[PDB]
Design a protein around this ligand. Structure first.
Ligand SMILES: *C(=O)CCCCCCCCCCCCC
Lengths: 214, 40
């Protein structure tokens, strides 16, 4: 399906999952959200735009915050992803995986901030190194453990008696992902994530928007 | 109080009479594309 790309970095894959081990040879994986999983990943200009001012309140502000990051640019690195998450699932491993491609050989930092009412609750920071691949360079975060806060959050979501209550909680839950060139501090990708519960028979869904000034 | 209080966040929806969280504008009331609310 549709993925996210700036001029310098393309995120081909993104997934959050729960993996259950029945026996040493049998593994069951449930995907909560996914990009570039069901069908080959792609990027094109056909996606819609969202006024960034409409979402500033849902993410950390001040120095280093979404507004500060957006103003510094480049503007083509900023995206909003709306996830419809598949929560229908019941040894366990909660994980997150992502993959990136760049024409450039960089050392990159991936910062993921979980936010409640626009306030940072927890941050995970990962440093990723390049591997040569067909003239370009690939970066991979493989099976990174989901933080306990997110595990706790998912548990509490599932224990809500009504699904509409889950949506009410998700109203004020966001994630901001900032992928940076470690040396230059250039914003390679900045992705704002918003969530709803999926009711689709196809499971989890997503829609990607460009973040713009209006 | 704390805005990042996990129990408070879930208490607000489970027991609305005891809700103690910031008040916000629901996304559905904001200037956003229709595709933001309708899955593909
Ligand atoms: C803790 O380390 C924060 C890291 C968060 C990684 C993003 C995972 C996306 C969560 C999707 C789960 C769906 C919950 C509605």
């Amino acid at each position: 399906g549709r993925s996210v790309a700036s001029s310098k970095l393309w995120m081909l894959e993104f997934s959050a999952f729960l993996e259950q081990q029945q026996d040493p040879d049998t593994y069951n994986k449930h995907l909560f959200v996914h990009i570039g999983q069901s069908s080959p990943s792609y990027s094109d200009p056909y996606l819609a735009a969202v006024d960034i001012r409409q979402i500033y309140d849902k993410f950390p502000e001040k120095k280093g915050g979404l507004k500060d990051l957006f103003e510094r640019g480049p503007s083509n690195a900023f995206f909003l992803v709306k996830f419809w998450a598949d929560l229908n699932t019941n040894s366990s491993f909660y994980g997150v995986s992502s993959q990136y491609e760049s024409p450039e050989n960089m050392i990159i930092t991936c910062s993921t901030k979980v936010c409640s009412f626009g306030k940072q609750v927890v941050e995970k920071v990962e440093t990723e190194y390049a591997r040569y691949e067909n003239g370009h360079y690939s970066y991979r975060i493989h099976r990174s453990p989901l933080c306990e806060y997110m595990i706790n959050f998912i548990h509490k979501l599932k224990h809500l008696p009504e699904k509409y209550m889950m949506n009410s909680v998700l109203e004020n839950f966001t994630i901001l992902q900032v992928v940076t060139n470690r040396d230059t501090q250039e914003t390679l990708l900045c992705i704002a994530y918003v969530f709803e519960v999926s009711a689709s028979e196809h499971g989890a869904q997503h829609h990607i928007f460009r973040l713009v000034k209006e | 109080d704390s805005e990042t209080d996990l129990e408070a966040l879930f208490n607000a929806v489970m027991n609305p009479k005891t809700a103690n969280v910031p008040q916000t504008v629901p996304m559905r009331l904001r200037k956003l594309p229709d595709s933001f609310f309708k899955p593909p």
